[PDB]
Design a protein around this nucleic acid. Structure first.
Ligand SMILES: [K+]
Ligand SMILES: [K+]
Ligand SMILES: [K+]
Ligand SMILES: [K+]
Ligand SMILES: [K+]
Ligand SMILES: [K+]
Ligand SMILES: [K+]
Ligand SMILES: [K+]
Ligand SMILES: [K+]
Ligand SMILES: [K+]
Ligand SMILES: [K+]
Ligand SMILES: [K+]
Ligand SMILES: [K+]
Ligand SMILES: [K+]
Ligand SMILES: [K+]
Ligand SMILES: [K+]
Ligand SMILES: [K+]
Ligand SMILES: [K+]
Ligand SMILES: [K+]
Ligand SMILES: [K+]
Ligand SMILES: [K+]
Ligand SMILES: [Mg+2]
Ligand SMILES: [Mg+2]
Ligand SMILES: [Mg+2]
Ligand SMILES: [Mg+2]
Ligand SMILES: [Mg+2]
Ligand SMILES: [Mg+2]
Ligand SMILES: [Mg+2]
Ligand SMILES: [Mg+2]
Ligand SMILES: [Mg+2]
Ligand SMILES: [Mg+2]
Ligand SMILES: [Mg+2]
Ligand SMILES: [Mg+2]
Ligand SMILES: [Mg+2]
Ligand SMILES: [Mg+2]
Ligand SMILES: [Mg+2]
Ligand SMILES: [Mg+2]
Ligand SMILES: [Mg+2]
Ligand SMILES: [Mg+2]
Ligand SMILES: [Mg+2]
Ligand SMILES: [Mg+2]
Ligand SMILES: [Mg+2]
Ligand SMILES: [Mg+2]
Ligand SMILES: [Mg+2]
Ligand SMILES: [Mg+2]
Ligand SMILES: [Mg+2]
Ligand SMILES: [Mg+2]
Ligand SMILES: [Zn+2]
Lengths: 48, 57, 134, 74
RNA sequence: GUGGUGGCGAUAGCGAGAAGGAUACACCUGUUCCCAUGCCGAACACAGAAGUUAAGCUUCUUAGCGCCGAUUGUAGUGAAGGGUUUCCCUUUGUGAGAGUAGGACGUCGCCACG
RNA sequence: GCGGUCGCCUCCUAAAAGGUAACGGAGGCGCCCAAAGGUUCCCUCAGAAUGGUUGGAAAUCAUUCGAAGAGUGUAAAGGCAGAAGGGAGCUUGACUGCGAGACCUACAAGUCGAGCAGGGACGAAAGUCGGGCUUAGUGAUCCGGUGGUUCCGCAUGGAAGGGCCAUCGCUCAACGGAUAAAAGCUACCCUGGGGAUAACAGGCUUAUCUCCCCCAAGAGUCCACAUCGACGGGGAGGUUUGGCACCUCGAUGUCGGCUCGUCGCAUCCUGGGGCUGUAGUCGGUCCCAAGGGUUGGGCUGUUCGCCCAUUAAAGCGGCACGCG
RNA sequence: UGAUGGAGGUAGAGCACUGUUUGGACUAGGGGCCCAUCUCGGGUUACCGAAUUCAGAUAAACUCCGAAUGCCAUUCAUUUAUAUCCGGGAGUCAGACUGCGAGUGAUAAGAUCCGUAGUCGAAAGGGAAACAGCCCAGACCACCAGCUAAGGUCCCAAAAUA
């Protein structure tokens, strides 16, 4: 089951990115180091 | 040197390219005559509509 | 004669123009039947000509059928209006263009060969003539 | 049941050999690299050949059996 | 001459045969070293210079294959016409593919050691 | 009408730019991947022969040949072996703000994009990276949900409620989406139009149909051709079953019968003739021949057809399937 | 219109790929026949025969190749006179046939659907007997003048009993 997901910056809680993932292949919340435009630096974003 | 070209055939029922060639040569009504230089371009136009015109030196 | 397999169930009727591309000379047999006109030839016509030729030859000698009915043609049943897709395949044909050597024969005297080819020609729909090997 | 077909994608050459084009002009639309990008030419994500800089378009042959597009500024 | 390194559509290739290592390149000896194999110092990496042109590589011969390929003719066809018009023919211009005559066992550069 | 179809991608049709229709010929899509993305490094396949425990055509291994005959998540086309294919390490550029200029295009959209800035991944560096070899994997607005926001806040401060930004809720698949919300009968029917469009007749076509031929394997005791003639081939006719939709829908009356006929000949009888597997009487087949003639009933609306009884014969067709 | 340079895979042709395919050679191998059966090893049909090879075909959805044309472009050349853009006003969205290239159809249709050029539509005049779409040719008018196109010249009926 592949679903659209939102990656939110952990630092400022800003829903910066939209992506998608297969729940079965990745049961746990995804986490990626992405650039947060609000904070203007690379931060850890975790699916919401 | 020179080419005296006379239109001996109607342009009705002819391809638009041939009609445009006649117009570019500057011929009008049937039997309309013009004189042009003997350039390669002019001779090419004459060859294109050879079946509609008669050419003299 | 029918192809074992076909890439496409249905096919264009096509167009025949000019001399045949190849096979305009007798290759295997001593004598051959050359088409002087272009026309479709059905597997039925090919078979009829072949049977006539063999029967007159008394199975003495060898016969080659140079042409093969690769193409298929469809049709629509009576009472079927135009449209609703192409018709179901009906028969098989070989587009034969003038100059094609449809049949060849060998291992028989000249008169027997000429008579056998004459019978085959009357079975076929194209005008033909006899051609000897070179 | 037949009767389906996609919209034509207007592929092919969009600039003539010997033509002057502004930088970034699309020169050739293609599926795959039917023609390769040459001098001052880039290839887009969908294989489209575009001019990097202003210049004259030239279609050369890349070796024995491959074509190529270059843009030569004047 | 050899080693690097490039340009030009293989006319630069392939096959076959032959000669050479002066240097050079090579095989070649090892795994202590950085480095490594989903096992193997075979590879890659490193150290070294006993032996050998055997192979690679360079040079040379070879038209067997591959490659290039004129001319002529023809198919097709633009244009103008004709015919008995699913097709065919004439004039004019263009003109292949194929088959061939032949060409070709490469050439044009730069660097270093000789 | 029934069946099929409706949006998007690929090929052929498509006539060597592009585009190009048909209820034309073929297939696919409504996803998938946390790597099957990025980068650095490295690697080259499918098959075949030969040899080899279980092991056999074919599991795994080795040598050789092997230029792609493999693979490329997923259809096809194009492309890729200087890889876009395969393996490993590290990573998240499957980045943010954009964007000269282009392609496509009625609009809405769609596509490509160097380059600039911010801050990064890989790599020594060059440099590559704004997803995947490319091209489908999608849906306008309205309305609503969620998060953010230095925006507004109906006297003022708040609030309520909005705006902006981000994103979610479409088989609105009839896929440019009528409405938040909808199936049928009409022969009780009615109106406005159309010969733009069917049924009758005409027209065109002649596949089918009727008729006539070609070849002659054969049947005919022998013997292709007295007679019949397979497998095939070629025509004529315009009476059949059809195809098209050209006149007529501000009306061209439809079957059968009756009355009246008239014409064609591919002749049912009568007339002339050739051949005969013609002894004779009968015939068979073919040729010429359209002058005349070619029936009365039972059944059925019938045409047709069967039957009864006759006749020299009980012809086949056209004439708006002649003639309201 | 010429010159020059390009993009592209059609006609044609070809078999280098993929399909379809014919004959020959050879045969892996499969077949039934007998011996040998532990069904084991032959010996067979010019038995059938894969793949290979030779020769020969074939293709809208094959291509080692590949035109003529058309197309794009050039501060180019000759001739010519339109092209853009901005705005006011429209009508058109039933087309027809003819020639050529295709599909559908039956290589039928005055059929249907495209591409392409012409004409009709919206075009009178001459020819084709009559005959929108074919051939010749574009009517501003007057003439009891002349020359020609297609097509014609024995009579209807102008012109050759050339
Ligand atoms: K015949
Ligand atoms: K070593
Ligand atoms: K050596
Ligand atoms: K060579
Ligand atoms: K990787
Ligand atoms: K709709
Ligand atoms: K009723
Ligand atoms: K009627
Ligand atoms: K007929
Ligand atoms: K006849
Ligand atoms: K007899
Ligand atoms: K009516
Ligand atoms: K008689
Ligand atoms: K009579
Ligand atoms: K009755
Ligand atoms: K009658
Ligand atoms: K009445
Ligand atoms: K082939
Ligand atoms: K083709
Ligand atoms: K205007
Ligand atoms: K047309
Ligand atoms: Mg397409
Ligand atoms: Mg992409
Ligand atoms: Mg040649
Ligand atoms: Mg074209
Ligand atoms: Mg095209
Ligand atoms: Mg990949
Ligand atoms: Mg207030
Ligand atoms: Mg719609
Ligand atoms: Mg009632
Ligand atoms: Mg009414
Ligand atoms: Mg009316
Ligand atoms: Mg009508
Ligand atoms: Mg009528
Ligand atoms: Mg119509
Ligand atoms: Mg009336
Ligand atoms: Mg008679
Ligand atoms: Mg009647
Ligand atoms: Mg009446
Ligand atoms: Mg062809
Ligand atoms: Mg029509
Ligand atoms: Mg009108
Ligand atoms: Mg007129
Ligand atoms: Mg009128
Ligand atoms: Mg005169
Ligand atoms: Mg007179
Ligand atoms: Mg005379
Ligand atoms: Zn943040």
């Amino acid at each position: 089951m592949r679903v659209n997901i939102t990656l939110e910056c952990t630092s400022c809680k800003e829903r910066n990115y939209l992506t998608n993932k297969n729940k079965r292949n990745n049961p746990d919340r995804l986490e990626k180091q992405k650039y947060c435009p609000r904070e203007r630096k690379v931060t850890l974003h975790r699916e919401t | 040197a020179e080419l005296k070209i006379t239109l001996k055939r109607s342009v009705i029922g002819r391809p638009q390219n041939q009609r445009a060639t006649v117009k570019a040569l500057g011929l009008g009504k049937v039997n309309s005559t013009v004189t042009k230089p003997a350039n390669e371009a002019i001779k090419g136009m004459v060859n294109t509509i050879s079946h509609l015109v008669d050419v003299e030196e | 004669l029918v192809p074992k397999r076909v890439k496409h169930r249905r096919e264009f009727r096509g167009k025949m123009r000019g001399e045949a591309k190849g096979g305009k000379e007798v290759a295997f047999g001593e004598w051959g039947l050359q088409a002087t006109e272009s026309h479709w030839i059905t597997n039925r016509q090919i078979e009829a000509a072949r049977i006539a030729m063999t029967r007159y030859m008394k199975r003495g000698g060898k016969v080659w059928i140079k042409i093969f009915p690769h193409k298929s043609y469809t049709s629509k049943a009576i009472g079927v209006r135009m449209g609703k897709g192409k018709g179901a395949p009906e028969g098989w044909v070989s587009p034969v263009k003038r100059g094609k050597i449809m049949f060849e024969i060998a291992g028989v005297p000249e008169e027997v060969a000429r008579e056998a080819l004459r019978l085959a020609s009357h079975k076929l729909p194209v005008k033909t003539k006899i051609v000897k090997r070179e | 049941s037949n009767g389906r077909d996609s919209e034509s994608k207007r592929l092919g050459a969009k600039s003539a050999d010997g033509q002057t084009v502004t930088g970034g002009s699309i020169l050739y639309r293609q599926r795959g690299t039917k023609i390769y990008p040459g001098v001052n030419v880039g290839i887009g994500g969908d294989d489209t050949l575009f001019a990097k800089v202003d210049g004259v378009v030239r279609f050369e042959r890349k070796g024995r059996d491959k074509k190529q597009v270059s843009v030569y500024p004047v």
